[PDB]
C-alpha cells in the first residue's frame, strides 16, 4: 500500500504520497473559510512502472505495453486511493456553519 507511513519515511522515485500544505486564502483565493486557514491535503506524484500498485487489469496491461514498446507513452497514473475528510468552519454573514468535506486529504495512492 502506497500510504503516508511508507511514502513519508522512505525515498520513493515512483508513485507515492507527497506532502502538501494548501492555504485556503493565499493558494486558492478562498477568503470564506474561517478554520482551518489551511490543511495538509497531500497529492500524488511519481512514475507508474509495471506491477506497481495497479488499480486494474488495464493498469497491468498498460504497464506491460509501456515497459516493452519505447515509442509508446500510454501509461497508468499515480492517483489517490485512500482519502480522509476535513472539518471546516465558516460564517454565512454572522451565522456559523460547520461542514465535514469528504475526500480532502490523500492518505494513500495507486496506479490507475
Amino acid at each position, epitope marked *: 500500500a502506497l500510504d503516508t507511513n511508507y511514502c513519508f519515511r522512505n525515498l520513493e522515485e515512483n508513485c507515492c504520497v507527497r506532502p502538501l500544505y494548501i492555504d485556503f486564502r493565499q493558494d486558492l483565493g478562498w*477568503k470564506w473559510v*474561517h*478554520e482551518p486557514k489551511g490543511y495538509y491535503a497531500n497529492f500524488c506524484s511519481g512514475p507508474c512502472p509495471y506491477l506497481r500498485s495497479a488499480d486494474t487489469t488495464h493498469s497491468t496491461v498498460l504497464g506491460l505495453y509501456n515497459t516493452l514498446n519505447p515509442e509508446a507513452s500510454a501509461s497508468p497514473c499515480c492517483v489517490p486511493q485512500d482519502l480522509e475528510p476535513l*472539518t471546516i*468552519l*465558516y*460564517y*454565512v*454573514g*454572522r*451565522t*456559523p*456553519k*460547520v461542514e465535514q468535506l469528504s475526500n480532502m486529504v490523500v492518505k494513500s495512492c495507486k496506479c490507475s
Partner: antibody
Amino acid sequence: EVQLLESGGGLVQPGGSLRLSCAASGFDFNSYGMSWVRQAPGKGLELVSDIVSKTYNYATYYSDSVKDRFTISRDDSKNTLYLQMNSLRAEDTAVYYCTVAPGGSFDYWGQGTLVTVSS
Amino acid sequence: DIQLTQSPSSLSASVGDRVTITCRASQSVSISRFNLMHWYQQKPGKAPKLLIYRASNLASGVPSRFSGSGSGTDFTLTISSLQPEDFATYYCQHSRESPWTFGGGTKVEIKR
C-alpha cells in the same frame, strides 16, 4: 498594521442626532463584517449594531436598545463604516468602538469616540 | 438570544498566583468540535484586545500564561502566573447566534 479611527462623537442634546464614522486601513475591508460596540461609563460592552460584507447582501442587525433609532452603513470604496444615531437618549452616552470580526471574534478595535447625551 | 454570565464579578490575586475566571452561556456555544467563546482584556483607558478565540486559541502576541478551555455552556480563562500588568477587566463574547452578546466582565485587581 490594522488601523480603525472613529470620529463624530461629542456633546448632543437629548432627542438629537449624530453621525459616527470609522476610517479603516491595513486589512481586506470589503471581505469582513464590521460592528459598533459601546461602553457606557463604568459599565460593560454592548454590541449595538452590525453589518456584513457585499457577499452577504450588507445585512444588518441591531440591539433592542437602538433598533429603529440607529442605522449602520458602510462605504467599501472609501473604507468607511457609519452610524446614524437618531432620537438620542441619556443611556446612549458611551464610548463607541468600531470593530472587525473576520469570523467570530473581534480581531481589531479602534480607540473609540465618546458620545455624551445631555441638555 | 444567548446571554453570558461571568463569575466572579471581581477578584484580587497576588503576583505569581493562578487566576481562574468562568463564563456561562444561557445555551450551548459549541458547533461540532468548535467552541464559539472568545475572551478580551480591557485595560482602564483602552479599547478591548482579543486574548483567546474559540475557547482555547491564544490571539497573536498574547503571553503563554493566558489560557482558555470549555465547551457547551461553561468556559474558563486562566492566567497561570499573574503579573502586575494583568490588571484589567476580562470579557467573554460568543459567536454562536445573532445577536452576539458579551458577559458583564470580571475585574482583576493585584493584591500586594
